Amino acid sequence: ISRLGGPNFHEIPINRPTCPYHNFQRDGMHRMGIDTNPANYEPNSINDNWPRETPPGPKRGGFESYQERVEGNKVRERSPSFG
Amino acid sequence: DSLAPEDGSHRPAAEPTPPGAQPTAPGSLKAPDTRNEKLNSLEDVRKGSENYALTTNQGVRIADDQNSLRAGSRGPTLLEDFILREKITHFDHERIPERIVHARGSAAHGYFQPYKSLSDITKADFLSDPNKITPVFVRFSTVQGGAGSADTVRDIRGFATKFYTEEGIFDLVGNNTPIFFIQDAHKFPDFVHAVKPEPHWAIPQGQSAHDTFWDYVSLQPETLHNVMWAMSDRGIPRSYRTMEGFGIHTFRLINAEGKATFVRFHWKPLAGKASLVWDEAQKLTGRDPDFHRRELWEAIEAGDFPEYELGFQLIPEEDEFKFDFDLLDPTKLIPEELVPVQRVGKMVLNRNPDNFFAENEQAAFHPGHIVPGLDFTNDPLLQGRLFSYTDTQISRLGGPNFHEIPINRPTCPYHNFQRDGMHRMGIDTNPANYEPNSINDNWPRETPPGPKRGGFESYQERVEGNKVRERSPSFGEYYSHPRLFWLSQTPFEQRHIVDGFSFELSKVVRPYIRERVVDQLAHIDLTLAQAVAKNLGIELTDDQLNITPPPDVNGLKKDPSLSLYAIPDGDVKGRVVAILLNDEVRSADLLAILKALKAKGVHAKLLYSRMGEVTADDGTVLPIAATFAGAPSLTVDAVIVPCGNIADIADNGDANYYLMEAYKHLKPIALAGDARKFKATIKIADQGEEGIVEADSADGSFMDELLTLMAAHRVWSRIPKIDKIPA
Amino acid sequence: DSLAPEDGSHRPAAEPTPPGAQPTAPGSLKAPDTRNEKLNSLEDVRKGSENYALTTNQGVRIADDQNSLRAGSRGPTLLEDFILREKITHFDHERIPERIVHARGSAAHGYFQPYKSLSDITKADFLSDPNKITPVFVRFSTVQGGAGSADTVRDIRGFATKFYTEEGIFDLVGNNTPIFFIQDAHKFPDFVHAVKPEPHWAIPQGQSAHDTFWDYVSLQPETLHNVMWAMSDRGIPRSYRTMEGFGIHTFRLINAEGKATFVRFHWKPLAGKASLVWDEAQKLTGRDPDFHRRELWEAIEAGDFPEYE
Amino acid sequence: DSLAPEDGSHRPAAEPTPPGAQPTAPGSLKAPDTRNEKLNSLEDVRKGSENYALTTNQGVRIADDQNSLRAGSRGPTLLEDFILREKITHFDHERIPERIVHARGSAAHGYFQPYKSLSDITKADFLSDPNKITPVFVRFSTVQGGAGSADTVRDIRGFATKFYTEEGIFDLVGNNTPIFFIQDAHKFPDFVHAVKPEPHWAIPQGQSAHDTFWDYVSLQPETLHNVMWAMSDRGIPRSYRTMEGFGIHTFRLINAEGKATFVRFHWKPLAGKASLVWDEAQKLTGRDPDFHRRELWEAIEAGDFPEYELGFQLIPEEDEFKFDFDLLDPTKLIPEELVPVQRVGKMVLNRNPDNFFAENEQAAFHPGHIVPGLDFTNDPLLQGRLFSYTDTQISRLGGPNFHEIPINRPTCPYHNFQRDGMHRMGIDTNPANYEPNSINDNWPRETPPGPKRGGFESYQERVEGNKVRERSPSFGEYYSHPRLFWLSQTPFEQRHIVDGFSFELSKVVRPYIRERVVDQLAHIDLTLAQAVAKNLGIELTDDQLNITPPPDVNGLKKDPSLSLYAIPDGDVKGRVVAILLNDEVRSADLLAILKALKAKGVHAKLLYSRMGEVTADDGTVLPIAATFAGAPSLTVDAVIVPCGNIADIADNGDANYYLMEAYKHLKPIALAGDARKFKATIKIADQGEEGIVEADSADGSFMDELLTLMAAHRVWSRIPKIDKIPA
Ligand code: HDD
Ligand code: HDD
Ligand code: HDD
């Protein structure tokens, strides 16, 4: 945000994905992308909810975190195993 | 030079004066002896001006601040004019990004003091002794509009308090309604984009009355509870002094033993609760877009300090699952019938800023700014807010040194190993910029958590579960709070809610969105749903008429503390009355009028058809504050018309309209002697009407009645009668 | 999903429709067949939406855009939720500084064409041939108020036109009155500070009706001419379509022979001159603070294209 | 924890100490009693550390600064860890844009005082009385390299002085050569882009030895004069203390009567003029890239304050056109044989900063920052500079309030109607933010020009001409100044110039560029062009051999003030000597050596093949500063080898190489007793040679002879002898 002047650093040519990127994020300094979506929020009916979420799956699926089991108290503590 | 008037009338007296008696001024010039530790610590950056030479920022005296340097007096401007370039450069870069939300706000300095030590439930230093005075800086705001938008819009209001404690800044960043629209912070950009001006054309400003807002609401039923509050008169406060404040989220209090107590924060207005009515609010956005900001500033300048009582709803840790709603769900309120608000202390706002931009615009509040003795909870909205308020000031306030901006500086010590960053003010002399270090003997050093002056240690809450992007099933209930709120309102408050929904949905262009919202209202209450539907020309279906109402909340069918007006709590001090003058006022009426108002701390504004002065029957010269059109009834709480030469104003359309507008907006109207001829313009029966004070003269009896009406705020019984007034 | 209604009433017709008949829409969706060289050159950065998956800015598809990642469904939000942090980060930095002056403005795309070659008096390429059309982008504005201030205030109005000529950008940055308040640019910050919201309390918004403005005017008689215009009904135009526009300054036209001609620039409203009355203007700031922005947008959507000579 | 050593050896004594004796430290801790008005004014922002608790920036004490908050000690880090996020956030935004040019620089605080009042020729307050002390902040720099680039590169050096006067900041922003490369500011970006790292691959750093620079020079002959200076030993100063400083442009002095006098600013090093030799300079960028920064800091810590004499070349307005060159052409110097430098005052640099970033990196100097009594001229390079230095700190220092960053603040009063802007610190209480105003009685007010404390008014220079983008024809002469410089250098200086050009042109990949530069040199001097051509395997054509040399400069065929060394100005104080120890040093030699050096303020560094200690012949324990490889001969001015057990280091390759390197770089070498066995390493005849001090012991005249050699800086007569020597 300071180094590349804002949240649109993914629009700096070298950083751009070569795959599709569509979402409801708008504005910010030096915005290049001109969004034509009538909607800038979801859920929306005015654009029939596009762009839409995609269920996780074997290929071309949405990102879903591995459901790792978390068990412990809220601590600022180094694990003894790292000692 | 000597441009000031020789009589000295350009400078306001540095003593408390009523609204409009003097020109307003910077806080330190208006009330130089109002002090607190924070205000005193700002003295190193305050700059004067009287008797100083005009200079560049580099300290060079300027000889001619009227012209650019040019070759010949009609020649080209020269690049070597550094004085001109410095001045234009500074001007060219005056603006900073406004806040993403809550861009429109008004702020004041004050102080807080507890009523008793709360050491049994929290080790927070600022709550440890009734004699501990903590300086505060409070900013009230709207949410949707820009910094230049209007104050009396229909919206949620922000109520942010920065406490400068001896153990750190604690920011209590709340709103004027006890819940928020959404449950998880991940949807904030979605909700906010939906309510803000639509992206193609950036319309509308300061209004939720547009398709995208209601589109979102209709598809996200969790929003309905706060939507109900926004649609009620809670969305249009009379003033920041007459609204409630809530932290919304359940937080934790941590005591010296380490016991955690769940708490919800409340601010109770000691001036009582009061709101405008929609037509008055909307029209007031055009007549005075700065009405709340002005009201706040002038109340403080008059000594009508905004006073609030901090209140805590306290819930034992073992009571976590004893309600039929989840305590961590920010779309759910904790009814005061179930958990009473414990009165904890009082905050008084007693001084305006000196420079709005430097102190208000640049102030940075963040709910994550807590101190030992307080802690967070897992509320998924609060959790995500923690990331945002630090992040947003990197662009808004230009960097990570925003705590060095004067208004944001802690008044207690701050020392760490952080260095550099844009506009670094602090010059660190520590030999070390890392820890652990031996070269400065490890200073500054960590401090173990402890009863007082200890370091921050999080409450060791047990966390068990899988990494999931999942809403708790406990948050999946959307209609019982909205119903509870609805049933707790008076009949006229209910009417105003129906009118709020009806007006807003009429401005939604796609008819299907209106229908989908009406369907949601049918899940809350059939009467509400039917009333709104009828105003939209919509017919409830068979199925919609049979939707079973949601269950009561832990047996409650209502809670009067949710209504603005159900339980009397009016306060007339700081209110204002418009007095409509004529060219030969019956001085006896004004004397009685003004004496009685002054005994209750009610201000008056003398109005006429022109500026200047009029002379009363006995020769008293009366100075006019404004014209009828100039200071419309929208700006006052009541209207009094004294006797005298009524024929002077009887045919003044503006005078007649003043009374009709006030009448329509349920304001107390008092008519003395021949001023009773104005009864025909507002069609009042010969035998009178409750809400209209009328007498042969303005004696003490007439004034007590009017002041009684003012304490009740508005004449709600007049509602059925305004329908037939063309105003 | 099945969110849009089955009758398709959520989408505004892509054809000229009168004010209020359809929901307004982004220009390229509302009027897809309108084009100019500039509008065509913006096509490389226009982004659609229909039928695309919701992604992060790095192109990663999102599965659940309704929740943060937490340890348990009632647990703490995790720092590894990069999807949440990107989304909130972008949101957190959406605002840029508003313009120092003229922050409140409404704009539209269009085109310009000269009636005849003006090569005898200027070598400016965009005026060299009646057949040469120059795309434009025009922004109308007030002066004093913020970007969120009201449209029908009493104020001067800005009329800025960006000409995308074949020999460079030509910006004609004028106002709706033929003169300015002050004579020398060095006093611009003085004048603007006087008219803007006073520094202690930041009141009033979008209005010159306060002490510092009149103080400045009373001490600087050069301001009276433009103040006369502001106090007239010129200060409250009915619409950006019914006001005049002026470059104010005398500039020069240089022909191919090197001859200079002094020139003052004018815009004549082909819809004629028309203003509101003060009570209406002021009430309208409350009833519809976006009235001029809305009126301009809707006129274009209806085919009532704003035309200026 | 309490990590410092119990003997307190972690902390440097707060007293003057020689280089290497103690850990260096922040200025206010090393020399707390060294004060000035500016240093005292910085006390409001200086922050200590000792005995303070470690906190967040909001003042909250931290209990555990070793760990993030997680769910379980092996669990995921939680978003609610605001302590971690504040800390990483500040870290993440530490850097600010470096300066576009002169990004690499070292600074110090000091004071200036005039020798006599200059009231007859200037009304500048800081020059009005010999007892008026003006605080200064000086930054020396290279030009091309980034902030992390090396110090001893071949480049021009910047010499910027901020004078905190009573009538405003005056920044004298100069270089170490009396001319610049280009004439008009419009070409600054071209010249700078040509010298900086090439755009495709960003190579090379800190060097003009690349194609684009020499391409530009070859096409723009106006650059040749400063190129001659950069190719000479001027381009590789021994230290910022031993180089000259120049304002370059002709400015104006204005007196109280309104008379304008043309002035060129000079800084004379009171330590004398001294430079390295190229091989040494280049290798030193590798062995110690911070050599100049370090040397400056340690000189000040040792009490060897860098001292400079400000001098003025003054030229009456009537003599503007009396020279062969234009006074406003920045590529032309004013020969001191024509116009002597009149001594004006002394500047002493006596305290290092506390925090480099806060004081050095954020300091902003600009030549447009002048005060009443000074004025500009039409020099077209200066004219455009006035635009750049204010503009550039809008990004570098984040906005228009860069004058509020502590180091930049005037110490005199500054008041005006400028408001807001990012990071605004000053809280203005003026009711008015515009002038003329009546509401504050027009304060702050303009001030008429006058003899003292008056407003700034530009000198009324006559301007006459058409609006043109045209170089004055008087500027179209490019070879006489270069030739005058060349002819003023000693024979070894000329050789070094020839070597500089030859080395740099050998790094130009495109041969035609080398040829084109050679052709330009042939327009300056045939000897110079031939010697460079010979080193590049280029033959001059018959035409080139017949190019007529440029005319003398106003009759001068040389000016010895242009040479570093033609006129001896040696000063040994602050220089340093390497002493190569052995494991049984003759203590008597060491006592004589160290005391002689200390009596002249010359420092010593005791070197050995390992660290720790060695024991002398009498049991004296000798602390080792560094190893032979650890502190190479590049970092010292001379080398002394005492007697003792020479067989210990006789076959040490590093010890032998130490002497070979120092020998090659023309430094004085002194060998006592058996240390004379090292003569065979550097091939010294039995009889001895000028530049090598040798005797049976370090007694008698041994030290005086070595100090005489150090006073002459380098042994130039050894050049022919180092030609061979594999080192
Ligand atoms: C995750 C993002 C997020 C969410 C879920 C909320 N907010 Fe927030 N709000 C912000 C992100 C934010 C912000 C982007 O960080 C802002 C605007 C700029 C700033 O300084 O803070 C802010 C400003 C802001 C202000 C103005 C402070 C001032 O006057 O400067 C108040 C009173 C609140 N918010 C109150 C609320 C309430 C009580 C919330 C729900 C319970 C809420 N916010 C949810
Ligand atoms: C010396 C400074 C100065 C002066 C004397 C004026 N302005 Fe200006 N104006 C500004 C400095 C400025 C500005 C600071 O540079 C602005 C605001 C932000 C922007 O980009 O430009 C600008 C904006 C601005 C705009 C809005 C452009 C847009 O829509 O983005 C218009 C229409 C004008 N100006 C019109 C004028 C006219 C007709 C002027 C008098 C003849 C005038 N201004 C004097
Ligand atoms: C028009 C552009 C321009 C030109 C023609 C000059 N430079 Fe400059 N220089 C700048 C534009 C600049 C600059 C971009 O504005 C800089 C870099 C960052 C800064 O603050 O100032 C600066 C830095 C800068 C510094 C560093 C100050 C520091 O330590 O912060 C010195 C010593 C000089 N320059 C000296 C000179 C001299 C003696 C020049 C020729 C006579 C010259 N410059 C030409």
Side-chain angles (χ1 to χ4, degrees), chain B residues 289-317:
Chain B
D290 303 307
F291 178 79
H292 283 161
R293 177 169 297 178
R294 183 190 311 281
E295 144 90 26
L296 178 64
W297 193 281
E298 286 176 346
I300 288 173
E301 287 204 348
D304 298 321
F305 310 141
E307 305 197 2
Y308 305 85
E309 182 169 85
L310 184 57
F312 293 168
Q313 284 175 295
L314 300 171
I315 300 92
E317 184 170 66

Short mmCIF file of all heavy atoms in Angstrom, two decimals, chain B residues 289-317:
data_model
loop_
_atom_site.label_atom_id
_atom_site.label_comp_id
_atom_site.label_asym_id
_atom_site.label_seq_id
_atom_site.Cartn_x
_atom_site.Cartn_y
_atom_site.Cartn_z
N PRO B 289 -27.57 21.97 5.84
CA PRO B 289 -26.87 20.69 5.76
C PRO B 289 -25.91 20.48 6.92
O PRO B 289 -25.48 19.36 7.18
CB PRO B 289 -26.10 20.67 4.43
CG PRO B 289 -26.13 22.12 4.01
CD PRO B 289 -27.34 22.79 4.65
N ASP B 290 -25.55 21.56 7.62
CA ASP B 290 -24.65 21.54 8.75
C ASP B 290 -25.37 21.64 10.09
O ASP B 290 -24.71 21.90 11.10
CB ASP B 290 -23.66 22.71 8.63
CG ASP B 290 -22.89 22.65 7.32
OD1 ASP B 290 -22.30 21.59 7.02
OD2 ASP B 290 -22.89 23.65 6.56
N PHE B 291 -26.64 21.30 10.15
CA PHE B 291 -27.43 21.50 11.36
C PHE B 291 -26.90 20.80 12.60
O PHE B 291 -26.83 21.42 13.66
CB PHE B 291 -28.91 21.16 11.12
CG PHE B 291 -29.79 21.29 12.34
CD1 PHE B 291 -30.24 22.52 12.76
CD2 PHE B 291 -30.18 20.16 13.04
CE1 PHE B 291 -31.04 22.64 13.89
CE2 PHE B 291 -30.99 20.26 14.16
CZ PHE B 291 -31.43 21.50 14.58
N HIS B 292 -26.54 19.52 12.50
CA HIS B 292 -26.03 18.81 13.68
C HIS B 292 -24.65 19.30 14.10
O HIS B 292 -24.33 19.38 15.29
CB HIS B 292 -25.98 17.30 13.42
CG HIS B 292 -27.33 16.64 13.49
ND1 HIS B 292 -27.59 15.41 12.93
CD2 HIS B 292 -28.48 17.06 14.07
CE1 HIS B 292 -28.86 15.10 13.18
NE2 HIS B 292 -29.42 16.08 13.87
N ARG B 293 -23.78 19.54 13.12
CA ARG B 293 -22.44 20.06 13.42
C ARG B 293 -22.53 21.41 14.11
O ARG B 293 -21.84 21.71 15.08
CB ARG B 293 -21.69 20.16 12.08
CG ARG B 293 -20.29 20.77 12.22
CD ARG B 293 -19.50 20.60 10.93
NE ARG B 293 -19.28 19.19 10.59
CZ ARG B 293 -18.64 18.82 9.48
NH1 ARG B 293 -18.18 19.77 8.64
NH2 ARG B 293 -18.49 17.53 9.21
N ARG B 294 -23.43 22.28 13.62
CA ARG B 294 -23.66 23.59 14.19
C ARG B 294 -24.24 23.47 15.60
O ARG B 294 -23.79 24.14 16.53
CB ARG B 294 -24.64 24.38 13.30
CG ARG B 294 -24.94 25.81 13.72
CD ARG B 294 -26.10 26.38 12.90
NE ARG B 294 -25.95 26.18 11.47
CZ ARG B 294 -25.21 26.86 10.61
NH1 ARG B 294 -24.48 27.90 10.99
NH2 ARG B 294 -25.20 26.51 9.33
N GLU B 295 -25.24 22.61 15.77
CA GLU B 295 -25.93 22.41 17.04
C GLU B 295 -24.94 21.97 18.11
O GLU B 295 -24.94 22.47 19.23
CB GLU B 295 -27.05 21.39 16.85
CG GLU B 295 -27.31 20.44 18.01
CD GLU B 295 -28.33 21.00 18.97
OE1 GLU B 295 -29.16 21.83 18.52
OE2 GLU B 295 -28.30 20.62 20.16
N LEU B 296 -24.08 21.02 17.75
CA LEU B 296 -23.07 20.53 18.67
C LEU B 296 -22.12 21.66 19.07
O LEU B 296 -21.88 21.88 20.25
CB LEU B 296 -22.27 19.39 18.04
CG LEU B 296 -21.13 18.81 18.89
CD1 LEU B 296 -21.68 18.16 20.15
CD2 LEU B 296 -20.32 17.82 18.05
N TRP B 297 -21.59 22.38 18.09
CA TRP B 297 -20.64 23.45 18.39
C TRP B 297 -21.23 24.54 19.28
O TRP B 297 -20.57 25.07 20.18
CB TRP B 297 -20.19 24.07 17.06
CG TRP B 297 -19.00 24.96 17.22
CD1 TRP B 297 -18.96 26.23 17.68
CD2 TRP B 297 -17.65 24.60 16.88
NE1 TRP B 297 -17.66 26.71 17.67
CE2 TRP B 297 -16.85 25.72 17.17
CE3 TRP B 297 -17.07 23.44 16.34
CZ2 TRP B 297 -15.47 25.72 16.94
CZ3 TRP B 297 -15.70 23.46 16.11
CH2 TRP B 297 -14.93 24.57 16.43
N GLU B 298 -22.44 24.96 18.95
CA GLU B 298 -23.12 26.04 19.67
C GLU B 298 -23.58 25.63 21.05
O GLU B 298 -23.57 26.46 21.96
CB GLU B 298 -24.27 26.58 18.81
CG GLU B 298 -23.70 27.42 17.67
CD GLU B 298 -24.72 27.94 16.69
OE1 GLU B 298 -25.88 27.47 16.67
OE2 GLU B 298 -24.35 28.82 15.87
N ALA B 299 -23.95 24.38 21.23
CA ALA B 299 -24.34 23.87 22.54
C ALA B 299 -23.13 24.00 23.46
O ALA B 299 -23.21 24.50 24.58
CB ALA B 299 -24.79 22.42 22.45
N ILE B 300 -21.96 23.58 22.96
CA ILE B 300 -20.74 23.69 23.77
C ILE B 300 -20.36 25.13 24.04
O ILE B 300 -20.04 25.49 25.19
CB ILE B 300 -19.61 22.91 23.06
CG1 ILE B 300 -19.93 21.43 23.22
CG2 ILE B 300 -18.25 23.29 23.63
CD1 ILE B 300 -19.05 20.46 22.47
N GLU B 301 -20.45 26.00 23.02
CA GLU B 301 -20.14 27.41 23.23
C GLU B 301 -21.09 28.08 24.20
O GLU B 301 -20.73 29.05 24.88
CB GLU B 301 -20.13 28.17 21.90
CG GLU B 301 -18.92 27.87 21.01
CD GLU B 301 -18.61 28.98 20.03
OE1 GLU B 301 -19.46 29.89 19.86
OE2 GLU B 301 -17.51 28.98 19.42
N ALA B 302 -22.32 27.59 24.33
CA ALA B 302 -23.30 28.15 25.25
C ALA B 302 -23.19 27.57 26.65
O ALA B 302 -23.89 28.03 27.56
CB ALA B 302 -24.70 27.86 24.72
N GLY B 303 -22.40 26.51 26.82
CA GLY B 303 -22.30 25.86 28.12
C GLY B 303 -23.38 24.80 28.26
O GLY B 303 -23.63 24.28 29.36
N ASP B 304 -24.03 24.40 27.17
CA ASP B 304 -25.00 23.31 27.18
C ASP B 304 -24.23 22.03 26.84
O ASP B 304 -24.57 21.33 25.89
CB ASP B 304 -26.10 23.43 26.14
CG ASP B 304 -27.01 24.63 26.24
OD1 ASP B 304 -27.35 25.01 27.37
OD2 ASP B 304 -27.35 25.15 25.15
N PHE B 305 -23.18 21.73 27.60
CA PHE B 305 -22.34 20.60 27.29
C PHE B 305 -23.10 19.29 27.12
O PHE B 305 -23.81 18.84 28.01
CB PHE B 305 -21.28 20.42 28.38
CG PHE B 305 -20.49 21.64 28.74
CD1 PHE B 305 -20.17 21.88 30.08
CD2 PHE B 305 -20.07 22.55 27.79
CE1 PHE B 305 -19.43 22.99 30.44
CE2 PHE B 305 -19.35 23.68 28.14
CZ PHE B 305 -19.02 23.90 29.47
N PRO B 306 -22.79 18.62 26.03
CA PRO B 306 -23.26 17.27 25.74
C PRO B 306 -22.75 16.33 26.83
O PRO B 306 -21.54 16.26 27.09
CB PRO B 306 -22.69 16.86 24.37
CG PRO B 306 -22.39 18.22 23.76
CD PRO B 306 -21.98 19.13 24.92
N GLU B 307 -23.69 15.72 27.55
CA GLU B 307 -23.36 14.81 28.64
C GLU B 307 -23.97 13.44 28.43
O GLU B 307 -25.13 13.31 28.05
CB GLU B 307 -23.81 15.32 30.01
CG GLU B 307 -23.29 16.71 30.31
CD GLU B 307 -23.36 17.12 31.77
OE1 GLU B 307 -23.77 16.33 32.62
OE2 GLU B 307 -22.96 18.28 32.05
N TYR B 308 -23.13 12.41 28.59
CA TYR B 308 -23.57 11.03 28.40
C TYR B 308 -23.16 10.19 29.61
O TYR B 308 -22.12 10.45 30.20
CB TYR B 308 -22.96 10.39 27.14
CG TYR B 308 -23.25 11.21 25.90
CD1 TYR B 308 -22.41 12.27 25.56
CD2 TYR B 308 -24.36 10.96 25.10
CE1 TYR B 308 -22.68 13.07 24.46
CE2 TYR B 308 -24.63 11.75 23.99
CZ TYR B 308 -23.78 12.78 23.68
OH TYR B 308 -24.03 13.56 22.58
N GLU B 309 -23.95 9.18 29.91
CA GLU B 309 -23.61 8.26 31.00
C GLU B 309 -23.16 6.94 30.38
O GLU B 309 -23.89 6.35 29.58
CB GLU B 309 -24.82 8.06 31.90
CG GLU B 309 -24.58 7.16 33.11
CD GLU B 309 -25.81 7.33 34.02
OE1 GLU B 309 -26.79 6.61 33.77
OE2 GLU B 309 -25.79 8.21 34.89
N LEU B 310 -21.95 6.51 30.71
CA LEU B 310 -21.46 5.23 30.21
C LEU B 310 -22.17 4.13 30.99
O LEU B 310 -22.26 4.24 32.22
CB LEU B 310 -19.94 5.12 30.43
CG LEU B 310 -19.22 3.90 29.90
CD1 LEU B 310 -19.43 3.74 28.39
CD2 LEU B 310 -17.73 4.00 30.20
N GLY B 311 -22.69 3.14 30.29
CA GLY B 311 -23.42 2.05 30.95
C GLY B 311 -22.89 0.72 30.43
O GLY B 311 -22.46 0.61 29.28
N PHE B 312 -22.85 -0.28 31.30
CA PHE B 312 -22.41 -1.61 30.94
C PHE B 312 -23.52 -2.65 31.11
O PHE B 312 -24.10 -2.72 32.21
CB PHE B 312 -21.26 -2.13 31.82
CG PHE B 312 -19.93 -1.46 31.74
CD1 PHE B 312 -18.95 -1.74 32.69
CD2 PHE B 312 -19.62 -0.56 30.74
CE1 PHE B 312 -17.71 -1.14 32.62
CE2 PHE B 312 -18.39 0.06 30.67
CZ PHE B 312 -17.43 -0.25 31.61
N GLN B 313 -23.72 -3.50 30.12
CA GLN B 313 -24.59 -4.67 30.31
C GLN B 313 -23.58 -5.80 30.60
O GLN B 313 -22.72 -6.07 29.77
CB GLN B 313 -25.45 -5.06 29.13
CG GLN B 313 -26.67 -4.17 28.93
CD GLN B 313 -27.42 -4.55 27.66
OE1 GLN B 313 -26.88 -4.41 26.56
NE2 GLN B 313 -28.65 -5.01 27.83
N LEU B 314 -23.68 -6.34 31.81
CA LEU B 314 -22.70 -7.33 32.24
C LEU B 314 -23.28 -8.73 32.28
O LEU B 314 -24.37 -8.96 32.82
CB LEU B 314 -22.16 -6.93 33.63
CG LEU B 314 -21.48 -5.55 33.66
CD1 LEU B 314 -21.18 -5.13 35.09
CD2 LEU B 314 -20.20 -5.58 32.82
N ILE B 315 -22.60 -9.66 31.61
CA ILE B 315 -23.05 -11.05 31.57
C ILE B 315 -21.91 -11.96 31.99
O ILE B 315 -20.86 -12.00 31.35
CB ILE B 315 -23.51 -11.52 30.18
CG1 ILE B 315 -24.68 -10.68 29.66
CG2 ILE B 315 -23.90 -12.99 30.17
CD1 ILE B 315 -24.23 -9.50 28.82
N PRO B 316 -22.14 -12.77 33.02
CA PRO B 316 -21.17 -13.74 33.49
C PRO B 316 -20.77 -14.67 32.35
O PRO B 316 -21.59 -15.05 31.52
CB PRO B 316 -21.84 -14.54 34.63
CG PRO B 316 -23.01 -13.66 34.99
CD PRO B 316 -23.38 -12.80 33.80
N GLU B 317 -19.54 -15.15 32.36
CA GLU B 317 -19.05 -16.09 31.37
C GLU B 317 -19.90 -17.34 31.29
O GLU B 317 -20.18 -17.84 30.20
CB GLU B 317 -17.61 -16.49 31.71
CG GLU B 317 -16.95 -17.40 30.70
CD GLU B 317 -15.46 -17.57 30.97
OE1 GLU B 317 -15.11 -18.16 32.02
OE2 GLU B 317 -14.66 -17.12 30.14
#
